[PDB]
């Protein structure tokens, strides 16, 4: 949630997506470490990062 404003985050692995734990292996109830950005050269004027 809205954690400490000044801090460093190096988190990874699914944050308990489902009831069963990830058990160190990806798959169900497990998500990728970080979703992918990638705006196109021309995708909206006020939309680029």
């Amino acid at each position: 949630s809205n954690l400490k404003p000044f801090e460093r985050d190096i988190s990874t692995e699914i944050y308990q997506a489902g009831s069963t734990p990830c058990n160190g292996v990806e798959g169900f109830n497990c998500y990728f470490p970080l979703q992918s950005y990638g705006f196109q050269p021309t995708n909206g004027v006020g939309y680029q990062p």
Partner: nanobody
Amino acid sequence: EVQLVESGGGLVQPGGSLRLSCAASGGTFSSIGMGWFRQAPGKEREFVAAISWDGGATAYADSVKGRFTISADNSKNTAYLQMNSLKPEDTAVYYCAKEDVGKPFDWGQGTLVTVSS
């Protein structure tokens, strides 16, 4: 009874590609653990893939890496499953499930998918 319509099941040649789709009858319009499970002949249920409704997270099993693509639509409230280069062992009955928050597992009728020459 959390109705889930299925489509796309049918016969396919070896190493083919189908167009599968599953749509949910509302289901609270919010799911957390949607995934696809299958039951092969002389075998039991096993994980295949899972995708997130609140985001773009996609989860795939070891044998369905890359070749299979799963995407969910928030506007039409349905899941589209696309695949390529299937193997004979893939013959099994698929199922689409919608996991609601803090509720048991929902299931549908599924479809029969057969691959052979």
